[PDB]
């Protein structure tokens, strides 16, 4: 069989995400959505008025905490409860 | 900025590289009209083309997008238009004086003039892979 | 460098006119033996040999065959046809077929070589994105009234926040609005990829520069043909690869026969510059002491690699049956046990040099990053 | 009988691989077996710039529609409780 | 100042990360610690020669300046370099953990290295030159016929092939069979105990 | 262990009497701390005191 010598490639626009498979990226996002929701569910427990408004992890903030941890640039918010810090 | 923008579009020395003047050498490379200098016929030019080697245009699903954006440039051109429209909104400060929306309206074009200008630099270089 | 012309060839006569390696030996061999000697180059310009068409001898051996010369102190290789008609001593030097190539292009990197694994045309877009993002992070967090005093993101703060994200330490002031965090997220994923690809591509430089292996043998020369290797056309070396039993040299003589350009050259000195015009893409095969001459000479650029592919020798020749046979052979061995020949050797290979020998040595001292490899960051 | 005598001694095979591979005027192992490095080119990482400039267009357009939202201007426990019934059953 | 100091640490610590990968990925053999000249410059590494040998007689009758230093130091090692047998000179290098070298004949230096326990190397060139010769009586009518055959043996490449059989194929493991073996490990506790220390 | 002479114990000479070892000053310092286990002995002292 005579085919042409393989032209090597051009690396794609979306080839920065090439060392990690198509499986693992959505599993990061499904881990991203999972961890960010749960800390919101944790931080809106432990009241002891502003007892249930004590700690500042809204559902949009709990995304923003779980996003900043993934990009390694940490944000201002930090968990105060024990089950929040786990 | 808009003056040097219109100069940069209609000028022809974006690059000096080794390439041909004409199918039967140092190039005086332009974006629309890619010329050549210091040749046998010193001074004549050539328009840009997106297919030196002839193959399928749609093949890699971004190769269709990359080639058509470069030669048919719009991102350095929407750089020109949005910077042109915002500069008229600088003159529109006096027309309906103290409307208190107009100066905000101008700077949106200027920031969008920056966003268009940077991506057109990228598609210029990324299409110049060789 | 065996026997050469002195620049004072006008004022002197004969013995005083010519100097070098063998001339120092020539006065020394005649010293331990005690005979009046007289130097004379043969005008034919011929190594000793015989031809089948004439059955005649020629050159230095030929004048020893034809009675003209009385002793041969010369770079004369000891072969069988020369043993047939004249004699030899014990060989006063050992040498062999070696490989010559120019030294690899070992330079020091620039002060801007820490910026190297990213191309120069990327660093303009990195700055232009940094200019591009920090103004947008200013606008989104400040163009809206809904009061507007509560934010802290000025034009100078939005640079200082975005410069903290790219350097990955991060600053104190975090975006708090909805769309103000959309810009702040993407620049984080921007600098996640660009810095990590910088760390990986920097590991691509330091590893591959440890992976590349030079030539230390014939086997490492045999297993690569992108660098060509050839020999001189008419000499001892070219016929040497023809009759070779060994499979290591057998592949080379087939390869040097199965190359389309001319791997054969005309002379030695043309073979010197031809490697210099190939720049680490051709290796030349010649005698080792002649090769050790060149890699001590200007521009200090060629180098001998590997070891001797065979072992030959240069010997002083007497006529067969002449009276000089034993006492010259008694004198050559006497210089070796005194170790005079090493001083006679290391004189003319170094004093004619001007180049530094053993300058390369090893590469263990440059195993880590030196100062100058990252001194530009201090600058 | 000579043909068998040739192929047993590898004479055919040395005649073959010389004349096909060695007399061939290029190499599969002359050009493919070299190792060289490259600095990253802008075409290699042009995608991260595309998401970034694409992000800033999305960062401004979200900001502008919220600008006309909050200028030209949801909390009722019953009807999204029905939306809790709809979505969780969905 | 904080901006310039940040890009400093972005380059310095990443240069640490990339090269420490390169030491562990491409773990080459350590370069020759001792060449011919340089072992004279190591007093922290030792070197020795035979007790009663003509190779010992070479350094006492040498006027060469580097070789003068070699005879100067070999009087100044306690215990002495002078081992009476070569098998002790073989064994002294092996148990010294690399601090002792032994200068002896290149033939015995090769053949020990091509045997068990595969536990030495031979580096550098020869210091002097000598040769082994076929000894015939003076006036014996073989002697001029014999050495013509020796030249005949060498010109065909036979005397290579006789030795290349006898020192390689009748040898073993060697140092040439070690180069391709690349194995990378987890970092052991001893390797970064100094961080814990 | 795993031989029929199990249950026979021996006073360990950590640096041996007759072995092929010449310990460096990073290791002879170490193996002395290994042999004379001062740091577990220091644990015995600091718990009891
Ligand atoms: N160092 S050198 O190559 O100039 C060199 C080469 C040689 C020397 C001495 C020196 Cl200094 N002597 C030997 C001699 C010793 C005995 C063995 C061969 C002759 C007789 N010949 S040699 O092996 O050709």
Residue numbers in the entry:
A (entry chain D): 502 to 549, 563 to 600
B (entry chain C): 1019 to 1042, 1056 to 1161
C (entry chain C): 404 to 549, 565 to 797
D (entry chain D): 748 to 820, 1002 to 1018
E (entry chain B): 601 to 797
F (entry chain A): 1068 to 1116
Quote the study's own text.
Here we determine structures of a synaptic complex of AMPA-subtype iGluR and the auxiliary subunit γ2 in non-desensitizing conditions with various occupancy of the LBDs by glutamate.
By contrast, non-continuous integral occupancy of the pore devoid of Na+ ions and water in the gate regions of the NNNN and GNNN structures confirmed that these are non-conducting. In the non-conducting state C, represented by the NNNN and GNNN structures, the M3 segments formed straight α-helices, and the methyl groups of all four T617 pointed towards the pore centre ((i) in Fig. 5a). For the channel to open to the first conductance level O1, both AD and CB LBD dimers should have at least one monomer bound to Glu. Although binding of one Glu molecule per LBD dimer creates a substantial separation of D2 lobes in the same dimer (d635 > 25 Å), channel opening requires separation of the D2 lobes in both AD and CB dimers.
